[PDB]
User: Fold Probable dihydroneopterin aldolase from Mycobacterium tuberculosis.
Amino acid sequence: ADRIELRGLTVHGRHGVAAHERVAGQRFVIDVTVWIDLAEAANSDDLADTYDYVRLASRAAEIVAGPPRKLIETVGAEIADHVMDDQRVHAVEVAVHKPQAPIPQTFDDVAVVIRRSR
Amino acid sequence: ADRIELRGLTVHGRHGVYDHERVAGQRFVIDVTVWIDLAEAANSDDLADTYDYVRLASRAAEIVAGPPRKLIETVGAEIADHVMDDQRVHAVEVAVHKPQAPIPQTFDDVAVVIRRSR
Amino acid sequence: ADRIELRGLTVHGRHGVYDHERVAGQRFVIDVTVWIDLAEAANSDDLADTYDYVRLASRAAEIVAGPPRKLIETVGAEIADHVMDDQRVHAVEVAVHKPQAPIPQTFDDVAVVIRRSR
Amino acid sequence: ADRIELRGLTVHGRHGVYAHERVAGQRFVIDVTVWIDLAEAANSDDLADTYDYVRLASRAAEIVAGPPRKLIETVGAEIADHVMDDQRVHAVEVAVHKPQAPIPQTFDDVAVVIRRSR
Amino acid sequence: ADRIELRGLTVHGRHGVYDHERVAGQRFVIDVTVWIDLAEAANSDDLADTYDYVRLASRAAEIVAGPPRKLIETVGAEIADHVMDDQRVHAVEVAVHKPQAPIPQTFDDVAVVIRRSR
Amino acid sequence: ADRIELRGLTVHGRHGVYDHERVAGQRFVIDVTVWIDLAEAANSDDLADTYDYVRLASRAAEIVAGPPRKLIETVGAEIADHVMDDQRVHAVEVAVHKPQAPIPQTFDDVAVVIRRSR
Amino acid sequence: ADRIELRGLTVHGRHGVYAHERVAGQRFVIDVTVWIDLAEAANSDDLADTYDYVRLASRAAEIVAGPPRKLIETVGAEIADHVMDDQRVHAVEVAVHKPQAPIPQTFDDVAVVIRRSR
Amino acid sequence: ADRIELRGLTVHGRHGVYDHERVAGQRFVIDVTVWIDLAEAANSDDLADTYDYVRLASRAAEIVAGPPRKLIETVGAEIADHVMDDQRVHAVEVAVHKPQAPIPQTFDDVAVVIRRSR
Ligand SMILES: Nc1nc2c(c(=O)[nH]1)N=C(CO)CN2
Ligand SMILES: Nc1nc2c(c(=O)[nH]1)N=C(CO)CN2
Ligand SMILES: Nc1nc2c(c(=O)[nH]1)N=C(CO)CN2
Ligand SMILES: Nc1nc2c(c(=O)[nH]1)N=C(CO)CN2
Ligand SMILES: Nc1nc2c(c(=O)[nH]1)N=C(CO)CN2
Ligand SMILES: Nc1nc2c(c(=O)[nH]1)N=C(CO)CN2
Ligand SMILES: Nc1nc2c(c(=O)[nH]1)N=C(CO)CN2
Ligand SMILES: Nc1nc2c(c(=O)[nH]1)N=C(CO)CN2
Assistant:
C-alpha cells in the first residue's frame, strides 16, 4: 500500500457559493494521499523514481490560491486531476477542508474528499 | 471513494438511559461521512449537484437537539436514515459521540457508529 | 487571587467592522476571569456566597449571540460591565477571541482582553 | 460497519516483562471497537438490544487493573474474548497502549491490537 | 518563584449543587501549584527537604473522590488548606476544573482557583 | 491590563546565523501583545479608537517574510518598534518562535520575547 | 488484523536530496505497523512468542539516525525489510514523516508509507 | 521582561528517589526561560550579544541525560546555575517535568520550577 501523504497544507483562498464569501476569503486546508509503487525509488535513492512531495505541495497551494470556485468539490478535483497527470500514480485522494465554513453551527471541520484512480 | 466529511459537530442534548441524564442533558459530538459521486459537482461547480454540507450540519443538530432518546444508537440511526433519503448517497456513517458519558472510569470518548448503505 | 475561570465559551455571532463579516457571522470564543473572594463560599458551601458560573456562561453567551457590534472590544466591555454589577467582584478580565477573523495571514488566534476593576 | 467505539480508557496497571515494571506499574490506555448490528437497538431504543458501553468500560478496566501479565498481548486477548462472549458481536478489536513503555527512545505510543471475529 | 506544579489530576467525584449531579457524578480535573523554597532540597538531594508530589497527588485525589460538596470552591479550599499544613509552603493555588459541567452552552472548561498564603 | 493579543502568526522566512539556514529557510511563528486603553473604543465602537489587528498582522508578517536577520531578537525588535509607533500604546511584547530550529535535540519550541514600554 | 503499532518515534537524522539538508539535519517521525499472529503469545505470555516492541524501536531509530539517504523512501524500505526478517510477520507498513521538510508552504506533515508483505 | 524561552526539551534520564525508577529510566521534559536584555543584540544582529539557544539546549540535555539525581529539583538547579554563569543573565526559570512519574493516580504532568536571580 505504498503511498505519499501530505497533511494540513494551509492556504488562504476565496472559494464559496456566495459573493460575500469571496470578498475576504478564508482558510483552506488540504490533504493529499498518492498511491504509487515506491520500491524502485528505495532501490535507486533517486528522486526521479518517486513523486516529489515538494511539487505536490506547491501545485496544491497554487490551485487553492488561484481562481475562486463555488465548490470545494471543484478545487479538490483540479488537484486530484493534476496528480493523475503522473501516469505512475495508481490513485489519489484529495481532502479539501473548510474549517471556517460560515455555518451557524459549532463544529471542528467540514471537508470533501475527491478520489481518482486508474 | 468520493465523500463529504463533517467532523465534531457539537450540540447540547438530552439522550441517556437514566432519568438523571435528561435533567440537564450533556454535550454530544457528531461526525457524518457521506459516500457520494462528486464528479458532476466538480464538473458543474453547481451546489445542486452535490450534498450541501450546510443542511447536513443543520439537520444533524436539530435531531440531536430534539426529542430525547434513551440510546445514542437511535439518534445516529435517525440522522443516517435522513441522509439516505437523498438517493445520490451510496452510504453513510454517523458517529454519535458521548464524551461526557457519566461513567466512573477515565476515558477520552465513547461513541456508536451507525452505517447505512444501498 | 481567588478567582472563577470560564474558558472557551464558543458562540456564533455577527460582530465585525465591514458588512461582509455580518452576513453569515463567525465563531467567537470567550474567556472570563472573575476575581472575587471565595472564602465564604468555601465555609458555607452555599451557591449564593459565590458567583454562579451557570448564569455567567449564559449571560456571556447572550451578549455574544446578540445584536452585532463593530469591535470585539465593545463586546468584551459589555460582558465585563455585566460581571462588575456584582458588588462582590474585585476585578474581571474578558477575552473575546476571533479565531476565524477574515484576514489573509495564517494565524492561530486574535483577541482583545478587556479589564475592569472597582 | 455498525460498531461501538470506546477510546482512551485510561487505567493504572502492572503488566511488563521486567520485575521493575511490577513494582509501581504504569499508565495503560485501552481502545475497544465492537462490530455489532445496532439496527434493532435503534428500533426499540432498548439498552438490552445493544452492548452496554458502561459494562464495556468497567470490565476492560477491571482486567487492565487485574492480575499482572508479562505481555500486553495477553491483556488484550482477555478483553477481546470477554467481548466475544456476547454472541451478537461479529468481531472486536482491542488495542492495548503502553505510552509510558520504559524504552530509551522518544516516541508517542506503542501498542498491540488483538482481533477476534467469527 | 520556586514551585511544584501538578497538572491535570483527573478524578471522578460527585460534587455539585443540584441533586441530578450526584446520581452518577462526573470528571473533575485538579491543578495544584505549591510555592516553596527548593534550594535546600537541591542542596541535599533528599526528598525530606521538599514537598513530595506523590503524597500531594494521592491526598488531592482522596479529597476529590470523597464525600460530595455542593461547590467546587469547597473542594479547592480543602486541598489548599491541606497543602498549607506544611509550614514550608509560602502559598498555594488549587484549580478545580469541572470540564463536564451540566450547562447548555458549549465551552472548553469552567474552574475555580483557590489561593491561600501566609 | 487592557490588551490586544495576536497568537501564532505563521510565516516562512530565512532568518538565522549560519548560511545553511538561509538556503531554504524555515517556519517562523509570531505572537504580539499590545497594551493599550480600550475604553474609548468600546464607547465609540469606532475602529479608529483602537489598534487595528488587521494592519498589525499584515505588517508583522511583512517584517518576518522580509530580508533575513541573523537573530530572531532583531526581527522581534523591528515588530515591537513598529507597534510603539502608535503613541497610544503603553507597551508591547513580541514573541518570535523558531519551532523548526535546526538543532540535534528533541524539543517543542525555542523563542525570544522582546518588550518595549513607555 | 492482530498487529503491533509503534507511533511517533522521533529521531534526529540527515536524510535529504540536497547537501544543505545533511549539514544540520532535521527531525524525523516514524510509525511502524506489524501484522503478525499474536494468539500464541497470549497463550503463553512469553516474549519469545511475539515481536519485541523494544527492539522494534531500537532498530528503527538506529536506521533513521544512520547513514543519510536522499529519500525517505529508502529509509522506510530498510526498516520494513528489517521487520520482514522475522518469518512470522505477515506484512508491515513503515511511515516515515518529515514534519520540518524545508518547503516554503505552510503544512502540518509530509510522509511516505512503505508496505511489504507476503 | 526581554527573555529567551526554550520549551519541551525531551531527554531520557534515570532520575528518581526509588531504586525501581533507576533500572530503565524515563522521559524528562525541560523548559528554560532566560531573562537578559536583548536590545544590544537587536542593534548588532550579532549572536555574541545574546544568549545562544543552541548551547542552551545542548548543555541542558547533557545535564538531564547525565548521572541521575534523586530529585528533579537538583536537576533543575544544575541547569539554572549553568545559565547564571553568564553574567549578562538577570534571572532564569527552569521547569523539570516528569510526565511519566510512577504514581497510581491519573494526571497529565508533574514538575518543579527552579528560579535564580541576582
Ligand atoms: N458539499 C458542499 N456543500 C456546500 C459547499 C461546498 O463547496 N460543497 N459550499 C457551500 C458554501 O460555500 C455550502 N455548501
Ligand atoms: N451502547 C450503549 N450503551 C449505553 C447507552 C448508549 O446509548 N448506548 N446509554 C447509556 C447511558 O445513557 C448506557 N449505555
Ligand atoms: N482591535 C481591533 N481591530 C479590528 C477589529 C476589532 O474588533 N478590534 N475588527 C475588525 C473587523 O471586524 C478589524 N480590526
Ligand atoms: N510485543 C511486545 N513486546 C514487548 C512487550 C510486550 O508486551 N509485547 N513488553 C515488553 C516489556 O514489558 C517488551 N516488549
Ligand atoms: N462558582 C460556582 N458556580 C456554580 C457551582 C459551583 O460549584 N461554583 N456549582 C453549580 C452546580 O453544581 C452551579 N454553579
Ligand atoms: N538567542 C539566540 N540564539 C541563537 C540565534 C538566535 O536567533 N538567537 N540563532 C541561531 C541560529 O540561527 C543560534 N542561536
Ligand atoms: N517523495 C519524496 N519527495 C521528495 C523527497 C523525498 O524524500 N521523497 N525529498 C525531498 C528533498 O529532500 C524532495 N522531494
Ligand atoms: N517534589 C518532589 N517529589 C518527589 C520527587 C521529586 O523529585 N521531587 N521524586 C520522587 C521519586 O522520584 C517522589 N517525589
